[PDB]
Amino acid sequence: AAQTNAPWGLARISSTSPGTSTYYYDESAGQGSCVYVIDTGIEASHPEFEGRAQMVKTYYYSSRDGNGHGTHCAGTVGSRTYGVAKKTQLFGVKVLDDNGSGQYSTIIAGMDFVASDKNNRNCPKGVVASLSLGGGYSSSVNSAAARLQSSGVMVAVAAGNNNADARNYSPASEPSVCTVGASDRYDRRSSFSNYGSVLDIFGPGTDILSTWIGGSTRSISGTSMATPHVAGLAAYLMTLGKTTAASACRYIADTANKGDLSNIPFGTVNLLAYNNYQA
């Protein structure tokens, strides 16, 4: 399948070169997979989600996304126009308040929630969790991400936006999950992207158009935007049967575009997520 005039990041993930604008992908499109977006919520009524999104858990007075961040990330995972895996099922877990903040204890509870809640959902092709959040190093936060991964969920986490080594941030620094840095449309490391040996992969993160609250759209930047590209890619590849939740991060690294990014510090992987789809 071909989506013309796609957001640059979608085009990038199906291309061996920057500078194109059509996204190419297998029509299975993540059907039968599920992606949890652990964030500020999801505006599931947005026409872009086509009834495939729902809130399953909140720790606050509402499950609605009063911020936009979680809706944007969910849109990059699986919206019809802005999403990588256009037929996946999206499940929102609201661990962040409408200012975008959340206590580590709530975030940990949300991860353990997903590890159990997947057993209440129909995801025959597999389960992914996208975590566009983080703070300073916490062994308890890393352990929660490790449990979620161990339970059979492909966990993708943001590297962070400090232009610093991600070893000092959580859950970015957990070795067993997929830690995602950000790139721009010219294949440069995004100016804010964290780096370091703990990164597994880069995805599009600068000037990413996606869904927003109030039935709208907007373009924003962050490792928060790169992470759902990788989460959606995992769901898509799992639906194709090419990999599993336990092996998808490694498979994405195996099959990435290699050596094409600029300003990658010595010792950080130079790997850009790529679907290897041959139309």
Residue 12 forms part of a structural domain:
yes
Structure tokens at 69: 């961040």
- In DSSP terms, which residues pair with 211 in a beta bridge? 217
| Cβ-count burial 175-203 (b if 16+ within 10 Å, e if not) | ebbbbbbbbbbebebbebbbbbebbbbbb
Provide the 8-state DSSP code for 265: P
CA distances in angstroms from 151 to 16, 139, 148, 170, 182, listed in the order given: 34, 18, 5, 19, 27
User: Does residue 160 belong to any structural domain of this protein?
Assistant: yes
**What is the DSSP secondary structure assignment for residue 251, as one 8-state letter?**
H
- The per-residue b/e assignment along 146-165, b for 16 or more CB within 10 angstroms, e otherwise, is bbbbebebbbbbbbbbbeeb
User: Residue 38 belongs to what H/E stretch?
Assistant: strand 33-39
CA distance 250 to 120: 27
Number of structural domains, the chain? 1
Q: Cα separation of 39 and 70, whole Å?
A: 5
Determine how many CB atoms are found less than 10 A away from the CB of residue 100: 15
Pairing between β-strand 33-39 and β-strand 126-131 as defined by DSSP bridges:
parallel
Q: What is the dihedral of CA 169, 171, 177, 183, to 10 degrees?
A: -60
Structural domain containing residue 236: 2-272
Residue 75 included in any domain: yes
Alpha carbon distance 9, 7 (integer Å): 6
The Cα–Cα gap between 14 and 165 comes to 28
Q: Distance (Å, rounded) from C-alpha 14 to C-alpha 159?
A: 22
Q: At what angle do helices 104-117 and 139-150 cross, to 10 degrees?
A: 10
177 is in an annotated binding site: yes
Is there a domain that residue 207 lies in? Answer: yes
Ligand-binding annotation for 171, yes or no, is no
Q: Catalytic residue positions?
A: 39, 69, 224
Name the E strands within 68-158.
Answer: 89-94, 126-131, 135-136, 153-158
Q: 77 with 37: CB under 8 angstroms?
A: yes
CB-based contacts of 214, cutoff 8 Å, min separation 6: 43
H-type alpha helices, 35-187: 69-78, 104-117, 139-150
Residue 89's Cβ-side half-sphere holds a number of Cα atoms within 13 Å equal to: 15
268: in domain: yes
24 Rama sector, left if φ>0, alpha if ψ -120 to 50, beta otherwise: beta
Q: Using the structure block, give the residue that is written with the tokens 């126009």.
A: 81
**Nearest by Cα to 244 from 149, 159, 180:** 149
User: In the chain, what is the straight-line distance between the N-terminal and C-terminal CA atoms, in Å?
Assistant: 7
For residue 175, say whether it is annotated as part of any ligand binding site. Answer: yes
| Cβ pair 68, 36 in contact under 8 A | no
Q: Where residue 252 sits, what CATH number does that domain have? A: 3.40.50.200
In the three-class reduction of DSSP (H, G, I as helix; E, B as strand; rest coil), residue 92 is classed as strand
- Specify the amino acid at residue 139: S
Asked whether residue 177 is assigned to any structural domain, the reply reads: yes
- Is 210 in a helix, a strand, or coil? strand
Residue 242, Cβ neighbours under 10 Å: how many? 15
279 occurs within a structural domain: no
How many Å apart are CA 200 and CA 222, to the nearest integer? 16
Measured CA angle at 127 (ends 35, 121), to 5 deg:
85
* CB-facing half-sphere around the CA of 60: CA atoms within 13 A: 21
Q: How far apart are CA 121 and CA 124, in angstroms?
A: 9
Kindly state the DSSP code that residue 105 receives in the 8-state scheme. H
CB atoms within 10 A of CB 103: 13
Nearest to 255 by CA among 88, 33, 16: 16
Reduced to 3 states (helix: H, G, I; strand: E, B; else coil), residue 122 is: coil
Residue 185: helix, strand or coil by DSSP?
Answer: coil
Beta bridge mates, 136 = 169
Amino acid present at 37: V
**How far from 81 is each of 13, 125, 143, CA to CA, in Å?**
15, 22, 35
- Which sign does the torsion angle of CA 265, 259, 252, 83 carry? positive
Burial (0-12, 13-18, 19+ Cβ within 10 Å), 19: exposed
Contact 275, 237 (CB under 8 A): yes
83 part of a folded domain: yes
